[PDB]
């Protein structure tokens with residue numbers, strides 16, 4: 001056999017890379033972490049640095065508070081027994097308020113109030129993290145594609161835990177925090193709405209999720225196939241097309257009669273991925289608010 | 303018919319079968335022996351589907367469905383109208399898929415690129431084949447395969463899943479899903495990072511790969527790097543499919559009950575099985 | 584019905600989106616061309632998009648796509664058939680001529696730069712203080728071709744500094760000059776580097792770089808193209 005470029009044959013290392021400066025406040029940047037030779041066989045060895053800053057601190061603190069709020073509930077459900085805690089870890093659940101409490105913030109602590117608190121922390125964690133993806137791009141003079149794409153995941157997340165529950169009139173609609181319980185909730189959501197397989201937005205979401213794996217397998221294999229001509233150096237292939245990008249394009253043109261460019265494939269990529277949760281969010285948002293039963297709806301389209 | 307840069311690559315050679323017999327193009331499409339094989343398998347397959355639709359009494363693409371032989375046929379042949387068409391169409395599909403991959407191989411050879419793409423496509427084929435061939439064979443009947451219809455294949459997913467309770471509890475299915483979700487996240491992030499560099503703030507210069515590394519390190523404290531991300535996209539999507547195939551091949555062959563029960567093995571470990579409290583006590 | 588409006592609307596959005604994506608992806612290589620280089624009569628149903636302009640960093644200028652295209656190099660290929668859609672056969676040595684899988688593109692004859700303006704790719708001796716951190720150090724090993732003869736020895740690794748990665752091996756030939764071998768095309772073994780794509784006689788033919796401490800995009804393409812080209816064109820002496 002010859003080289004397949006899945007794992008490197010030789011690692012090289014030099015001075016830690018502290019990164020571009022541009023408008024970045026360098027005082028908010030950590031130092032480098034350690035180097036991971038094991039990681040270095042596949043990807044980069046260098047860990048860190050990371051940017052912190054005020055938003056990131058707020059985001060991480062909030063996120064930890066969410067995590068700890070759930071975890072303390074689990075400790076409580078375990079009777080503070082570490083053995084029970086480990087045994088039943090996936091079975092524990094922090095559940096939203098019962099339907100009778102509606103949207104009321106006056107739900108009892110042990111009956112949805114703590115769920116509301118955990119949810120408040122998650123909400124600020126995620127939205128401050130979003131702010132971050134925007135500001136980190138801005139400080140570097142970059143486009144906002146990351147923050148734009150993240151917004152599509154946030155849309156599904158928002159629909160599940162916030163928008164749909166408000167439109168339905170109770171927090172009881174929202175998703176509980178537990179490993180198995182979130183699965184049971186997903187199963188049940190479909191059963192109660194007449195089987196999501198009849199929701200045309202769930203079928204789209206699936207086409208795009210499968211499509212994402214199809215397209216990343218294609219793109220990833222293509223780039224690796226032309227890495228012998230520097231194909232992974234995609235930004236320079238955009239600025240100054242090379243034989244890597246040409247052979248990439250022609251493999252596909254000859255295979256299926258059309259092809260992308262080095263820049264344009266990345267637009268196919270970003271849209272394929274964001275459409276998963278864009279269509280999904282719409283599909284979930286319409287369930288119960290507009291369509292009680294997807295089977296029934298499909299028999300009518302009305 | 304040709305891209306502006308294309309003519310220098312349209313040279314002879316690279317074929318696996320037939321020398322120069324089929325070494326030519328139709329418009330953008332390369333032919334090759336396996337191009338002709340794809341056409342033969344696909345045309346036959348589609349004709350048989352059309353025949354099946356006639357015997358079913360419908361032309362509606364929403365309704366046409368080609369079912370595998372009833373379980374009573376086991377792993378033998380069935381009358382054309384009672385599962386035999388499904389069996390021939392399955393051979394045509396396999397022949398068509400494999401031909402398509404082998405054509406890709408001929409294309410790789412002419413362009414002098416690596417074989418990564420047909421290698422990856424082969425995971426898709428092996429997953430298809432897990433469902434229609436390996437799993438049915440291991441279970442002892444063609445009738446355990448899915449049917450070829452737009453809506454009926456979905457009936458089959460639903461019915462098969464619910465045979466084992468909530469199929470969410472299949473642990474290999476969990477891993478597959480995590481790979482699918484993670485693949486989509488990485489795809490979105492890769493497309494976005496490249497584009498954010500190539501299309502910066504108004505009036506600014508294109509950013510460099512160094513700015514891509516910097517943005518992601520600033521964000522999460524790591525960057526896998528340009529080669530790493532393309533390796534990763536491939537590992538995630540192929541791992542997804544590997545675990546999909548794994549999760550089905552074990553279902554109805556070494557595991558037969560509600561998947562939810564499988565998790566009892568952890569709950570019942572002797573050092574905590576009988577401690578009161580929590581969910582399972 | 585509101586779900587009905589939503590689904591019908593989404594499909595209209597999707598048609599729109601695909602149109603946008605397909606056109607974006609025609610920024611290079613279009614208009615399509617007959618095999619003689621003239622504009623093809625059929626261009627398909629998507630129009631070329633409005634040009635966009637990339638501001639290249641390091642005062643390297645600008646790139647506007649789509650725009651007038653040409654190969655900017657001669658192509659030693661001739662038609663084998665009157666009708667279109669047949670192969671163009673090499674008129675000379677396809678490896679020396681840079682056609683077929685040995686093709687190269689007329690990229691800039693300047694080195695790729697990193698984010699600070701420095702050359703991206705440097706011989707490791709010039710890259711402070713880079714070193715081999717894991718795996719077999721190939722420096723000092725004999726380089727073997729597909730004919731199983733020794734064509735030279737490894738005298739350095741050329742490293743991508745910003746990505747901290749081995750990009751080429753510098754190989755010294757019998758006559759004391761060197762060539763760059765792409766890292767993707769070599770197998771580092773314990774007692775040797777093996778190059779499947781080239782027999783020993785073919786190494787002298789690898790295109791040379793103009794300055795011994797840097798490599799240009801043009802030169803990478805010529806080097807990479809040539810080495811890849813040998814998988815098809817050195818198959819007489821392979822026998823791997």
Ligand code: BCL
Nearest residue numbers: 202203204206207208210211214348430448452453455459
């Ligand atoms: C993968 C595990 C399950 C599976 C469960 C699911 C579920 C759940 C769903 C689908 C859905 C889809 N499935 Mg299915 N499906 C199965 C495996 C198959 C196979 C196969 C193995 O050969 C095929 C061709 C399909 C194809 C289809 C598409 C009709 C549809 C969108 C998929 C998609 O965009 O993919 C991504 C890839 C692309 C975007 C590339 C585009 C290729 C597609 C569009 C080709 C479809 C052709 C189809 C009409 C067959 C015609 C063949 C001709 C006779 C030549 N399924 C197995 C049994 N499938 C969804 C649907 O809406 O169904 C109604 C859906 O909700």
Ligand code: BCL
Nearest residue numbers: 153154157186187189190197202205206209280281283284
């Ligand atoms: C019995 C179960 C039902 C079912 C009911 C559900 C339900 C319910 C839903 C789906 C949804 C989906 N289903 Mg379904 N589904 C069915 C079976 C199928 C089958 C199949 C049979 O093969 C398939 C392939 C799918 C596939 C899919 C996906 C296309 C889609 C989820 C997209 C996604 O990326 O979400 C994953 C991504 C997110 C949830 C976004 C998360 C966003 C961010 C903000 C996360 C922040 C995390 C952070 C705070 C914590 C990180 C910790 C770290 C350590 C830092 N379903 C059956 C019929 N399905 C979803 C959908 O959209 O439907 C339309 C959905 O709500």
Ligand code: BCL
Nearest residue numbers: 426427429430459460462463468469470478479546547550
């Ligand atoms: C009630 C339903 C059950 C369910 C029961 C099942 C069952 C049953 C199965 C899955 C399987 C899947 N489920 Mg499940 N599962 C459910 C809930 C979910 C949820 C969710 C969010 O709740 C998700 C994300 C998933 C996701 C998963 C995936 C891991 C997996 C499907 C992808 C795959 O096999 O690819 C593999 C890819 C292929 C098979 C496609 C290959 C096609 C290729 C070779 C070529 C076709 C091309 C040609 C025809 C195109 C024509 C050319 C045109 C010109 C385009 N399931 C619920 C609990 N799940 C399936 C699985 O793992 O299968 C292996 C499966 O059989």
Ligand SMILES: CC[C@H]1c2cc3[nH]c4c(c3C)C(=O)[C@H](C(=O)OC)c4c3nc(cc4[nH]c(cc(n2)[C@@H]1C)c(C(C)=O)c4C)[C@@H](C)[C@@H]3CCC(=O)OC/C=C(\C)CCC[C@H](C)CCC[C@H](C)CCCC(C)C
Nearest residue numbers: 059060063067125126129149150153273274483486487490
């Ligand atoms: C287009 C849809 C796809 C998608 C895209 C997407 N996701 C996004 C974004 C995008 C583009 C990113 O920009 C953003 C990101 O930053 O990615 C790296 C993100 C993101 N998607 C994530 C997860 C995620 N995405 C989901 C999937 C998807 N995302 C879709 C498939 C899912 C699924 C499939 O269920 C998950 C779980 C995160 C990695 C990140 C959002 C980060 C975030 O909002 O964080 C808030 C919370 C914290 C800051 C802290 C939480 C604490 C933890 C609970 C554990 C504690 C450990 C701690 C980190 C250690 C520190 C301790 C020290 C003090 C020692």
Ligand SMILES: CC[C@H]1c2cc3[nH]c4c(c3C)C(=O)[C@H](C(=O)OC)c4c3nc(cc4[nH]c(cc(n2)[C@@H]1C)c(C(C)=O)c4C)[C@@H](C)[C@@H]3CCC(=O)OC/C=C(\C)CCC[C@H](C)CCC[C@H](C)CCCC(C)C
Nearest residue numbers: 210213214217344347395398402422423425426451452455
């Ligand atoms: C392994 C990772 C992912 C992946 C990989 C992958 N797919 C790919 C590629 C690779 C890299 C190929 O290079 C190849 C390609 O050329 O893509 C553009 C391909 C491909 N994957 C495709 C589809 C596809 N891939 C899927 C999945 C995946 N692809 C995985 C998630 C799915 C899903 C998820 O359901 C679909 C439907 C095609 C676009 C293409 C292969 C096209 C091809 O083989 O064509 C030759 C044959 C025909 C044109 C038709 C033959 C018709 C048959 C004779 C009869 C039909 C019978 C069929 C079984 C009926 C099914 C009915 C359904 C309703 C169930």
Ligand SMILES: COC(C)(C)C/C=C/C(C)=C/C=C/C(C)=C/C=C/C(C)=C/C=C\C=C(C)\C=C\C=C(/C)CC/C=C(\C)CCC=C(C)C
Nearest residue numbers: 070071072119120123157158160161162175177178179182
């Ligand atoms: C070892 O023990 C310790 C304590 C040390 C640590 C261990 C902790 C553990 C074990 C934690 C476990 C965490 C788990 C199991 C989390 C699982 C989370 C899952 C599966 C979530 C899945 C879905 C979540 C969704 C969809 C959440 C939606 C949230 C929103 C959209 C927020 C909505 C905002 C609300 C309701 C607040 C209203 C107020 C405003 C801001 C208007």
Ligand SMILES: COC1=C(OC)C(=O)C(C/C=C(/C)CCC=C(C)C)=C(C)C1=O
Nearest residue numbers: 487488491492495518524525526527531
């Ligand atoms: C936009 O490209 C991306 C990178 O940016 C250059 C990343 O690096 C990562 C994160 C990669 C991995 C495997 C983390 C695992 C290693 C650690 C830190 C233990 C992802 C997903 C990505 O999409």
Ligand SMILES: CCCCCCCCCCCC[N+](C)(C)[O-]
Nearest residue numbers: 030031032033047048522523524
């Ligand atoms: C989504 C990928 C997750 C990446 C996590 C990377 C770990 C961050 C640690 C870097 C911090 C460096 N250090 C130790 C100096 O703080």
Ligand SMILES: CCCCCCCCCCCC[N+](C)(C)[O-]
Nearest residue numbers: 200201203204207211268271272
């Ligand atoms: C990046 C764009 C790729 C578009 C892929 C579109 C696939 C269509 C899948 C059919 C879904 C059918 N359904 C159930 C929603 O009606």
Ligand SMILES: CCCCCCCCCCCC[N+](C)(C)[O-]
Nearest residue numbers: 256257258329330331626627628
């Ligand atoms: C949603 C799946 C539909 C599959 C259709 C395949 C599209 C390929 C079209 C490219 C052919 C271009 N053309 C006609 C000039 O050859």
Ligand SMILES: CCCCCCCCCCCC[N+](C)(C)[O-]
Nearest residue numbers: 351363364366367368450451452
């Ligand atoms: C054997 C599976 C059924 C064959 C389906 C016939 C293929 C026609 C293409 C799909 C038709 C699209 N649509 C929207 C009308 O369903």
Ligand SMILES: CCCCCCCCCCCC[N+](C)(C)[O-]
Nearest residue numbers: 257258259601605626627628629
């Ligand atoms: C799922 C996405 C479907 C993409 C298929 C439509 C794009 C193919 C048409 C490209 C035509 C090729 N051409 C003539 C411009 O060279």
Ligand SMILES: [Fe+3]
Nearest residue numbers: 219223234492
């Ligand atoms: Fe890429």
